[PDB]
């Protein structure tokens, strides 16, 4: 539900990123990460929680690189 919308938003983030639309990609990454953090906050299972952290960390790493690039300008 919340993970379905996170997937939708993150697919757009990756698409915008591949098109070099950096400010737009960054917002979609932030928004998708927010939703994934909301799913994580509501999850009790340790494997699911740990796997969700890996997914979030991977998207966070990409968005931190985009922000660093935009900040240089």
């Amino acid at each position: 539900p919340q993970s379905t919308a996170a997937a939708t938003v993150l697919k757009r983030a990756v698409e915008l990123d591949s098109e070099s639309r950096y400010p737009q990609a960054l917002v979609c990454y932030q928004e998708g990460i927010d939703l994934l953090l909301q799913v994580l906050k509501g999850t009790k299972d340790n494997t699911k929680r740990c796997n969700l952290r890996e997914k979030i960390s991977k998207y966070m790493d990409r968005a931190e690189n985009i922000k660093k690039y935009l900040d240089q300008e």
Binding site: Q30, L40, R53, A63
Partner: peptide, 14 residues
């Protein structure tokens, strides 16, 4: 864990 990632998200939005 959630706090570290939420801090990373807030810094991203600064």
């Amino acid at each position: 864990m959630e706090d570290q990632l939420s801090r990373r998200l807030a810094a991203l939005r600064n």
